[PDB]
Amino acid sequence: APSGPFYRVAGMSYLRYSNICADLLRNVLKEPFKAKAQARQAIHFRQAPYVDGKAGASKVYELENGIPKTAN
Amino acid sequence: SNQAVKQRIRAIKNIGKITKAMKMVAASKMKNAQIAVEQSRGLVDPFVRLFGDFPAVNSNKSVVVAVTSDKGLCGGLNSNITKYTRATLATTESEGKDVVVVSIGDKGRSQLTRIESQRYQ
Amino acid sequence: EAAAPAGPKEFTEVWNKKAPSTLIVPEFPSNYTAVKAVGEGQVHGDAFPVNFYTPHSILSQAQKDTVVLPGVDGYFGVKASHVPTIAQLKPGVVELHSGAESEKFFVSGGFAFVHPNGVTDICVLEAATLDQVDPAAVKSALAAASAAQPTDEFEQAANRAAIELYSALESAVEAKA
Amino acid sequence: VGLSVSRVGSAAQFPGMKQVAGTLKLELAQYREVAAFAQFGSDLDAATQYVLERGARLTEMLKQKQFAPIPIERQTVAVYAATKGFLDKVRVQDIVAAEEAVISQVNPAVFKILKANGKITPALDAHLKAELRKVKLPGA
Amino acid sequence: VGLSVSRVGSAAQFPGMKQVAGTLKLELAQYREVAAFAQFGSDLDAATQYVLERGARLTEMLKQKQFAPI
Amino acid sequence: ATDLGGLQERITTTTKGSITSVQAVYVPADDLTDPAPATTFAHLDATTVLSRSIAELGIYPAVDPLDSTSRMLNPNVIGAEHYNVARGVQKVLQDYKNLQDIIAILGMDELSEEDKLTVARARKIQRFLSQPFQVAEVFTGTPGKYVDLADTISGFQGVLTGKYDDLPEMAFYMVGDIKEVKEKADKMAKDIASRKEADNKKVSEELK
Amino acid sequence: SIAELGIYPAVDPLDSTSRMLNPNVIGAEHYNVARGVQKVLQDYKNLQDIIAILGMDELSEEDKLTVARARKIQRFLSQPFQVAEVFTGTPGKYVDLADTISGF
Amino acid sequence: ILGMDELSEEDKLTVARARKIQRFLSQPFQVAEVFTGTPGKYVDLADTISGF
Amino acid sequence: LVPIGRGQRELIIGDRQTGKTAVAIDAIIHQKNCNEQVPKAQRVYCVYVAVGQKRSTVAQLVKLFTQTGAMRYTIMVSATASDAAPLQFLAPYSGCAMAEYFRDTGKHGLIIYDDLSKQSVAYRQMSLLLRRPPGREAFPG
Amino acid sequence: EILVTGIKVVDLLAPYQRGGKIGLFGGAGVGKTVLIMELINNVAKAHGGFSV
Ligand SMILES: Nc1ncnc2c1ncn2[C@@H]1O[C@H](COP(=O)(O)OP(=O)(O)OP(=O)(O)O)[C@@H](O)[C@H]1O
Ligand SMILES: Nc1ncnc2c1ncn2[C@@H]1O[C@H](COP(=O)(O)OP(=O)(O)O)[C@@H](O)[C@H]1O
Ligand SMILES: [Mg+2]
Ligand SMILES: [Mg+2]
């Protein structure tokens, strides 16, 4: 449907595109410096849609390999 | 009779060991996480230099997030911004507009779903 | 038209009516930034303040005389008073110059502003100096990238990003001066 | 340890113990002030975790089974093997072999010289430090 | 309830009550074992909270008036 | 017990006359378990235990609401509406007493939002039990307040239901009725506006 | 306080002592599982001070394991009695000696 | 819990003062000089006040 | 929760004005509701022993028993606070002997020794004045 | 029968019987003479009989 850059027409937001390029730079570093890469790459949080003001939902992320490059 | 006050003294004595250990745990964490906050302060500067800072804008839809804590021994932090949430939320919403209230940290999901439950998504 | 002037010192007037006086006025991020864009200055010659940033690291806040940025329409240099520019950057080498010296960070993307008061800001997400990259992993990654082409458009958007970043990194390590 | 006193003190103890147990009771006293930090997960200033792992292996140096008293020269070596830093920094699954392995593998001449002199001389701790590093425990 | 014991237990109460007061006696103990953890209020995995709404509905069951025995 | 019981059994209402006796009982070193106050407790219809720690808060009369009892506090004697707001006032004051050491060693920041309403209401009714006396007006200066019975039952319905969560805690302190807390909550906000009132200058009086 | 958790027989596992608790009498494998149980039960008694302040969620799974094991051991020291079936309802159990050493 | 580095200027002059006040509260004794070598000092009150 | 039995001794213990008499009064009131219902031999004959109480509390309690009809099955022994110390000492035994008539003849009794903590104080007064040597809290041995 | 005293904590939580025994338990300086003088001030003037 939409227009814009190649990520934006593929449903990919800018924050996911610029993070996919970000960790792909971190994957090819030297091992003294790649040790400091998966520290700031790991995503560890959980979310819950509150559709009612009453209860939550689910969706928990334990990704230590970065932002999901797969579809969403 | 006289043993109840003796082992209650044992209760308060090592609570004074717990909360003195916990204060240094939080002081070591505040020390090493202080330099990460100094680094991230740089990148917020080019955007208010470029896009400005316009709080009192008229919208039809607005997402307000409240960044609270997760564990709750912080003592007057997560309650203070839920005062500052509604002090900021009500002063900007008089146009009959939509509002989504989000919280980061589950001390807000215990605190904001009873003061703003209709707008908590 | 400018008939609706929002702002930080104008937020206080609506906030002294509906919000109680028990709470002091909430802070705003402009109260922590000394440097702005529309108030002129900061050049006074041939140097201009350059602020190179990742979200995790302030890489420079010094004053340089030439900044070479990898824009999406190609590399471009920024001298002392460049035209005000919001330039989207592609994967490439940000090159800082103060004189005879040069530091070459390879960035992953992310914009670069030049402001009407001559200040400039480079806003990237990952900036690796080229001596922190080993080239043996780079060509084995582009060969892993430009081979597998799934028909899902979310992956070929990620594949084009992998192709564009690893190619510019390969040419960044063969272009030693 | 904090409540047990000796008013005679170190003036009536073994001189080979007096130079070794002087730092033993200080590092056990540091361990008592950091005793609440032992139950924590969020580590502290590895200057306090240095106390906490060394102190908690110093208390195991003072455990002892019933109706088996130890000669004094075998105690001063086993406290030398914990106060001078020869501690079980190996992952401490292997306690049953390595606990008694000091006095059983270190050769018995260093107990005869320590008993007859009553003191770890400079000519002896160099062989104590030589003997302490060649502890075999090869089943582990 | 945590301090009031009886030496007889069974065979000295109503047999109909003995079927329904057995699941009252321990279920009030599950109410008291967690009431010393009602200051944090995180009420995890909906178990230490579920006994709170049922344990509070059993103590209000036993409240009764004066000079009106049932 | 038989000396005190010999004296206290003579003070009764008989069929030919009533004695409404009010006795002050001294507890000897603030020990209510001392054998002379403990013996007297069984001889009375209404005990009003006064507390040294309530008086150190400044609440006068220093009556412990969770230690004072009466045989009249029965719904078949005083009516069910007066009785129910007495037992609800004693319910939230006991719930505030159960929180008294969590609020001490952890502060009010860690209570629930339904227990911070318990604390704020019970901190209001223990100021609203306070009252100025017509015999204490000499040494306190404030005039005494006689409160009628229906003004107390209706006033303590309101702090329990939540009709006066707006008002500050100190507006309830040392006032007679629930009318007087509203007329003191105004005066506490007339007074913080009176800092900006006027600049008092005394002019030209040296020759008058 | 053992009985008020509903654990019966309400034996304090620490305050109980015997002359037979000796590896020269009952053997070194009966002895070490007795001392191993009292070690994890004393460790749980020293952790319940900080659990009521924190919540037993940050103990980093070496003291979450010694809580989870000691809480199983407190229940596994309880036992139905044959003389107590007439007021609790469940039939009593005789446990043999080898069947409680290997079970613990 | 924080460190000697971030102490204030008027809060680390007192630390440099109180550290040498408490050194100058110590004193060698004449009765202890028979086994410690350093001779003992009798300090008058006029020299104690001005010295502090 | 705490089920009583027919020959069982059950203590009602608490502080002052916690409802100890009220539990025992509700027992006696409830037996009158059951005695008009059971066949003639499961009837329970209550005895209230009022030791050390004031005399107006006892009359306030007889008034509750005759207006309930519980006074048809109830004996009330009352050695009040004005009575001599050997009368309050002896009134639990006087009331138990009256209640043992029903136990020894095939019927069922229910005795309430209200303030058995006040019998021991009356017995302590006798023993200290017979110059028997005192013990814990000056009680007799 | 109730005896109203005009005191909020007395009329609400522990009401006084019109012909009953009333105790004011106190610990030297807590106010049980000021309370008993206020009861003289409040109920003795409204009483029709004789005070002692
Ligand atoms: N179930 C109940 N519901 C409501 N009120 C009750 C209940 N039980 C007792 N009360 C009230 O509690 C007060 C104290 O009760 P009671 O006199 O039975 O206790 P007590 O301990 O025997 O007193 P004392 O110590 O004076 O002998 C009484 O005024 C009574 O009306
Ligand atoms: N209702 C009250 N209002 C103000 N102050 C009071 C009140 N009751 C007592 N006080 C203070 O408490 C003190 C004790 O008074 P008093 O009743 O004479 O002592 P006691 O209770 O020991 O007989 C008085 O000096 C008075 O200052
Ligand atoms: Mg009674
Ligand atoms: Mg007086």
CSV table of C-alpha atoms in Angstrom, one decimal, chain J residues 6-51:
chain,number,residue,atom,x,y,z
J,6,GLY,CA,-21.5,16.3,74.3
J,7,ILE,CA,-18.1,14.7,73.8
J,8,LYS,CA,-17.5,13.2,70.4
J,9,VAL,CA,-15.3,10.3,71.3
J,10,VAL,CA,-17.5,9.5,74.3
J,11,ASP,CA,-20.9,9.8,72.6
J,12,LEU,CA,-19.9,7.8,69.5
J,13,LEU,CA,-17.5,5.0,70.6
J,14,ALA,CA,-18.3,4.3,74.3
J,15,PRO,CA,-21.7,5.9,75.2
J,16,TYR,CA,-22.5,6.5,78.8
J,17,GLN,CA,-25.4,4.8,80.5
J,18,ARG,CA,-27.7,7.2,82.5
J,19,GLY,CA,-27.5,5.1,85.6
J,20,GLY,CA,-24.3,3.2,85.1
J,21,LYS,CA,-20.8,3.1,86.5
J,22,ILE,CA,-18.2,5.0,84.4
J,23,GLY,CA,-14.5,4.8,84.6
J,24,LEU,CA,-11.9,7.2,83.2
J,25,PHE,CA,-8.6,5.3,83.1
J,26,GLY,CA,-5.5,7.5,83.0
J,27,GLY,CA,-1.8,7.6,83.6
J,28,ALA,CA,-0.8,10.9,85.4
J,29,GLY,CA,-1.1,13.8,83.2
J,30,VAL,CA,-3.2,12.5,80.4
J,31,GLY,CA,-6.3,14.4,81.3
J,32,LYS,CA,-8.7,12.5,83.5
J,33,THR,CA,-9.4,15.5,85.8
J,34,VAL,CA,-10.0,17.8,82.8
J,35,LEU,CA,-12.3,15.1,81.4
J,36,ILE,CA,-14.2,14.6,84.7
J,37,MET,CA,-14.5,18.4,85.0
J,38,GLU,CA,-16.0,18.6,81.5
J,39,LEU,CA,-18.4,15.9,82.5
J,40,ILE,CA,-19.4,18.1,85.5
J,41,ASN,CA,-19.6,21.0,83.1
J,42,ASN,CA,-21.8,19.1,80.6
J,43,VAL,CA,-24.0,16.6,82.4
J,44,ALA,CA,-24.4,18.0,85.9
J,45,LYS,CA,-26.1,21.2,85.0
J,46,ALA,CA,-28.5,19.3,82.7
J,47,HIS,CA,-29.2,16.8,85.5
J,48,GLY,CA,-32.2,17.4,87.7
J,49,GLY,CA,-30.9,15.7,90.8
J,50,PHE,CA,-28.0,16.1,93.3
J,51,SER,CA,-24.3,15.8,92.6
